[PDB]
Every structure is written in structure tokens, then in C-alpha cells.
């Protein structure tokens, strides 16, 4: 049987979180560190993310606003710099790794002056301000949370959306089940698991898209827009 939940694969939740924190503390604060040796795919990623997001920014009743975005698991701000700052008047960042948020101030340069809050916190401990964000962007980090913490975090995110706001998840997906990476202390979940968690959080799918033009050897990557 494939595993369907993190409670089948995580031996010790405190250790699951503490190992991950130790792992990121020893990664270079660079794009290649953010992307696990795949820094070269960054522009492919950012281009696809932009096209994806722009579907929600068209004029009409449901137009997503452009006042403020939240970058979750932001690291040094790769996504903040190239995707979000150009489109949103202000951006807030949240990440567990202080060294990355420090580096972000250099990495983001002058445009980084529009980053408002730098929150140094685990997602599992973070409660975003109600009615604050037009877009909450969650990329390449959901594997670091347990199913219970991810569902809860998504509920808190829902309460922080402005009218017409969306949450975006973009992440690695397993073909089947829930797969533990015991080196970076994360899990990779299949699309059925991720959709289940989204539904548990009282969220609905607006769109789902597979990322194209990636190296053949890596986990498939999907984007979900939610409200």
C-alpha cells in the first residue's frame, strides 16, 4: 500500500522539524541553494509562475488585487525579486532561516525597499494578519510541514486573504503516496493527498497546472490556485 499521510512516514515530529532547520542553516544563501543545485531552472520556473498568476489579474468581478503579496518559505527572495515585487506594491516574506532573510536584503537590491515585513518563523508557527494579502505564494516548502500543520497553515492563510485574494501552492508532487526525504527532512506527496489537504482547509481549486520544461529526473511540479 502507498502511504497517504505524514503520520505514516514521520517517526518523530520534533526531529522532523529540527533536522530541516539544521539542514537549511548549512545551505548557501544563493539561488542554487534555494533550488537544490537546479539554480539554472529559475527563469523557466518564474516565467511559468508569471503566466499562471496573470490569469487572476485580468479585469472583472473577481480580479485579484496587486497591493500586497506574501512569499512563504521565501528564502533569499528568488520569487519575491523576479515575480512578486514587479507586480505587487509591497511584499512580505516569511522563512524559518534567518541567514536567508539577512541575505535577501542584499539580493533584492533597491526594489527590496518595498519588502515590508521580514518574518523569521516556521510556517507552522506563523499567523498572517487577517485581510492583508491579495496573493499568498507558497512554493517549494509544503513538504516541510506535517499534514495537520499544512491544513492549519492553509486555514490561517485563508483568513488573511483580501477580497478576491488567492493562495498559490507550487511544489514537488509524488507519482503515488507520501515519500520521506530523510536528508533535508521533508515529504513529497501525490496529487490526491495534496488535494485532500486543500479540501480539509476549506479551500477550492481555481486552477491546477503541471510545470513544463523541467529536467526528466526530478519530481513533477504543479501549481494550484486556491480560494
Amino acid at each position: 500500500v502507498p502511504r497517504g499521510s505524514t503520520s505514516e512516514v514521520i517517526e518523530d515530529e520534533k526531529q522532523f522539524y529540527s533536522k530541516a532547520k539544521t539542514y537549511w542553516k548549512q545551505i548557501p544563501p544563493t539561488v542554487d541553494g534555494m533550488l537544490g543545485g537546479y539554480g539554472h531552472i529559475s527563469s523557466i520556473d518564474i516565467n511559468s509562475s508569471r503566466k499562471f498568476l496573470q490569469r487572476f489579474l485580468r479585469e472583472g468581478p473577481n480580479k485579484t488585487g496587486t497591493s500586497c503579496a506574501l512569499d512563504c518559505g521565501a528564502g533569499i527572495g528568488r520569487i519575491t525579486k523576479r515575480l512578486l515585487l514587479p507586480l505587487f506594491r509591497e511584499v512580505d516574506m516569511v522563512d524559518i532561516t534567518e541567514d536567508f532573510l539577512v541575505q535577501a536584503k542584499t539580493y533584492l537590491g533597491e526594489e527590496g525597499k518595498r519588502v515590508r515585513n521580514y518574518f523569521c518563523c516556521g510556517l507552522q508557527d506563523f499567523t498572517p494578519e487577517p485581510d492583508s494579502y491579495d496573493v499568498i505564494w507558497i512554493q517549494w516548502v509544503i513538504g516541510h510541514l506535517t499534514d495537520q500543520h499544512l491544513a492549519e497553515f492553509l486555514r490561517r492563510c485563508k483568513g488573511s486573504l483580501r477580497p478576491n485574494g488567492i493562495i498559490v501552492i507550487k511544489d514537488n508532487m509524488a507519482q503515488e503516496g507520501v515519500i520521506l526525504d530523510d536528508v533535508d527532512s521533508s515529504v513529497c506527496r501525490d496529487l490526491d493527498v495534496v488535494r485532500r489537504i486543500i479540501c480539509s482547509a476549506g479551500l477550492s481549486l481555481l486552477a491546477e497546472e503541471r510545470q513544463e520544461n523541467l529536467p526528466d529526473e526530478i519530481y513533477h511540479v504543479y501549481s494550484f490556485a486556491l480560494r
Binding site: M34, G36, W140, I179, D181, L214, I218, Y219, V221
Partner: peptide
Amino acid sequence: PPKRIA
């Protein structure tokens, strides 16, 4: 990050 299928 993006990563090799184990």
C-alpha cells in the same frame, strides 16, 4: 527544492 526522484 526541485529534486531527483529517489
